[PDB]
Amino acid sequence: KLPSPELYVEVTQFYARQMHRMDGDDFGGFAATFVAGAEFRLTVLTGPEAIEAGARAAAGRFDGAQPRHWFDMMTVEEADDGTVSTSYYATVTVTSAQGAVLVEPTCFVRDTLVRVSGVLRSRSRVIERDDLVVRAR
Amino acid sequence: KLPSPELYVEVTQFYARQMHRMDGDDFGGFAATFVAGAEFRLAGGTVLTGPEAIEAGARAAAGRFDGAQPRHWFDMMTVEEADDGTVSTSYYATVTVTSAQGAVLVEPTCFVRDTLVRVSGVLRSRSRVIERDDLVVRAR
Amino acid sequence: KLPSPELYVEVTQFYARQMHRMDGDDFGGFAATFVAGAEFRLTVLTGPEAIEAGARAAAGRFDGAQPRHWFDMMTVEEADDGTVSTSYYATVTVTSAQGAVLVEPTCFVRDTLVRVSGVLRSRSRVIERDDLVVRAR
């Protein structure tokens, strides 16, 4: 079932704002986009406190360089109970002080979003890393 | 000339599902998104006609990935709907290839022009023309 | 807060056409998407003539190769006075005659768009280059 244009637009804006916070080191604001008990599976982090700690930790890998998350090829579907399911491609570019760019291994991501007080929030995120999948075959 | 929001959303979902199938090695499902007699024009000038030829070409081309994982990325997409429902798009595309060792290759970028048509209410690919930017540069 | 689906679509088409022109060396057509007195902050360029000349000059860095601009993670909001504000991630790929793809340092871009005779045009563009931000911190 195709999503309504309003839902599709709302989803694009949710992800843009969520990733701007994560990439901008607003780890608490990033985690606040998740509901209590949200499941983030890379190993699972459950709930915003754990998700905030993980984003802070994973950001350590960038040192002082600047990450940017890139999403594309995103499916969006609304269930009758209002839950939104997405699947998409994601990567992170990492730009150094000298202008070098590293492109991280791509991921295939599956999300569920829920509406809380009229606004979308992340309920579940499951990340499949393409290098690990390749390695496993 | 702007596409309706419904059409724009429909196009984004068509392409997301189409590339998920191709990148996931569902070459039959990828080819099934094309109509009978669809024309697929490769960067080099070879044309594949019909979904069966397109499936065979897509499977053969995937050999270049050598067990690594491709991901197609589209961006900067124009969308135009003709009065008869035919949809024309143009966009940028590239492919990343991620290996078991975490290597990421970025393939030469392409400029792609498609036509889509509606069959029993759903979009299908009718024409795809790929211009590869390295080949364009070489000709210049 | 959320843009109408019509506005969202119009913005994607505006940017697709603007970048196709710039990447295709249609520097005048690129500049025509800006209003008179538009401000482009890299140094500031004011007006379509200066923006065209600067874009032509900047393209010299590609040296016979083919650039492609990639935007993603785009916020879109309409202000009460009809001004449209966007923020997005941008990078440029540069593909050589041998198919080597250079990936330029990423940018965080903030635009304002305005409607002129019913048509969207760029009023202001401010580019923050991520390597320079990293260097500064």
Q: Is the dihedral of CA B76, B105, A73, B133 positive or negative?
A: positive
Contact residues for C26 (Cβ-Cβ < 8 A; gap 6+): C20
Q: What angle in degrees, to the nearest 10, is found between the helix axes of C5-23 and B5-23?
A: 60
Contact (Cβ atoms closer than 8 angstroms) between residue A126 and residue A41:
yes
Name the pairing type of β-strands A101-103 and A84-95.
antiparallel
Test A97 with C134 for CB contact under 8 angstroms: yes
- Three-state SS for A32? coil
Q: Is the dihedral of CA C105, A111, A61, A22 positive or negative?
A: positive
Contact (Cβ atoms closer than 8 angstroms) between residue B10 and residue B18:
no
Q: What angle in degrees, to the nearest 10, is found between the helix axes of C5-23 and A5-23?
A: 60
Contact (Cβ atoms closer than 8 angstroms) between residue A105 and residue A131:
yes
Task: Give me the amino acid identity at B75.
Answer: D
Torsion of CA B113, B67, B61, C96, to 10 degrees: 60
Nearest C-alpha in B relative to C73: B75
List the structure tokens of C70: 């990639």
Residue with the two structure tokens 């070409």: B57
Residue with the two structure tokens 């094309």: B34
- Element of type H or E holding A134: helix A130-135
Phi/psi for B96 (5° steps) reads -95, 145
CA distance B69 to B37: 29
Contact (Cβ atoms closer than 8 angstroms) between residue A64 and residue C137:
yes
Name the pairing type of β-strands A119-129 and A34-41.
parallel
In chain C, which residues have their Cβ closer than 8 Å to the Cβ of B92?
A: 68, 70
Phi/psi for A124 (5° steps) reads -150, 145
Task: Give me the amino acid identity at C86.
Answer: T
Contact (Cβ atoms closer than 8 angstroms) between residue A11 and residue A86:
yes
Phi/psi for C49 (5° steps) reads -60, -45
- Element of type H or E holding A20: helix A5-23
Q: Cα angle at C120 between C56 and B87, to 5 degrees?
A: 90
List the structure tokens of A12: 């694009």
Contact (Cβ atoms closer than 8 angstroms) between residue B24 and residue A130:
no
Give which of A2, A11, A12 to mutate to test C binding, by max C Cβ within 10 Å. A12
Residue C88 bridge partners (DSSP): C109
CA distance B114 to B103: 31
Test B73 with A72 for CB contact under 8 angstroms: yes
List the structure tokens of B118: 């509606």
Q: Cα angle at C15 between A120 and C123, to 5 degrees?
A: 100
CA distance C54 to C32: 14
One DSSP character per residue, chain C reads: -PPPHHHHHHHHHHHHHHHHHHHTT-HHHHHTTEEEEEEEE--EEESHHHHHHHHHHHHGGGTT-EEEEEEEEEEEEE-TTS-EEEEEEEEEEEE-TT--EEEPPPEEEEEEEEEETTEEEEEEEEEEEHHHHHHH-
Instruction: Kindly report the CATH number assigned to the domain that includes residue B19.
Output: 3.10.450.50
Q: Is the dihedral of CA A78, A87, B27, B114 positive or negative?
A: positive
Minimal CA–CA distance to C102: which of A72, A130, B134?
B134
Task: Give me the amino acid identity at A97.
Answer: A
CA distance B69 to A106: 9
Structure-determination technique:
X-ray
C13 shares contact with chain B (CB less than 8 Å): yes
Residue A69 bridge partners (DSSP): A92
Q: What is the 3-state secondary structure (H, E, C) of chain B?
A: CCCCHHHHHHHHHHHHHHHHHHHCCCHHHHHHCEEEEEEEECCCCCEEECHHHHHHHHHHHHHHHCCCEEEEEEEEEEEEECCCCCEEEEEEEEEEEECCCCCEEECCCEEEEEEEEEECCEEEEEEEEEEEHHHHHHHC
CA A133 vs CA A49, B33, B67: distances in Å: 28, 26, 11
Task: Give me the amino acid identity at B126.
Answer: R
CA distance B47 to B49: 6
Contact (Cβ atoms closer than 8 angstroms) between residue A8 and residue B9:
yes
Name the pairing type of β-strands C119-129 and C34-41.
parallel
CA A44 vs CA A39, A49, B77: distances in Å: 7, 13, 36
- Three-state SS for A106? coil
Residue with the two structure tokens 């959303």: B9
CA B111 vs CA A2, B81, B115, C67: distances in Å: 27, 19, 14, 11
Range of the domain at C29: 5-136
Minimal CA–CA distance to B129: which of B85, B75, B89?
B89
Give which of A6, A74, A86, A89 to mutate to test B binding, by max B Cβ within 10 Å. A89
Test C134 with A96 for CB contact under 8 angstroms: yes
Name the pairing type of β-strands B34-41 and B47-49.
antiparallel
Phi/psi for A35 (5° steps) reads -80, 160
Distance from the Cα of B22 to chain A's closest Cα (Å) equals 12
Question: In this structure, how many other beta carbons lie within 10 angstroms of the beta carbon of residue C80?
Answer: 5
CA distance B91 to C61: 23
Max intra-chain CA distance, chain C: 50
Q: What angle in degrees, to the nearest 10, is found between the helix axes of A5-23 and B5-23?
A: 60
Q: Cα angle at B71 between B70 and B76, to 5 degrees?
A: 145
Q: How many domains does chain C have?
A: 1
Phi/psi for C106 (5° steps) reads -75, 160
CA distance A123 to A48: 10
Q: What is the 3-state secondary structure (H, E, C) of A44-93?
A: EEECHHHHHHHHHHHHHHHCCCEEEEEEEEEEEEECCCCCEEEEEEEEEE
Binding-face residues of B in 17-76 toward C, CB within 8 A:
73, 75-76
List the structure tokens of B12: 């984004």
In chain C, which residues have their Cβ closer than 8 Å to the Cβ of A69?
A: 73
CA distance B12 to B69: 22
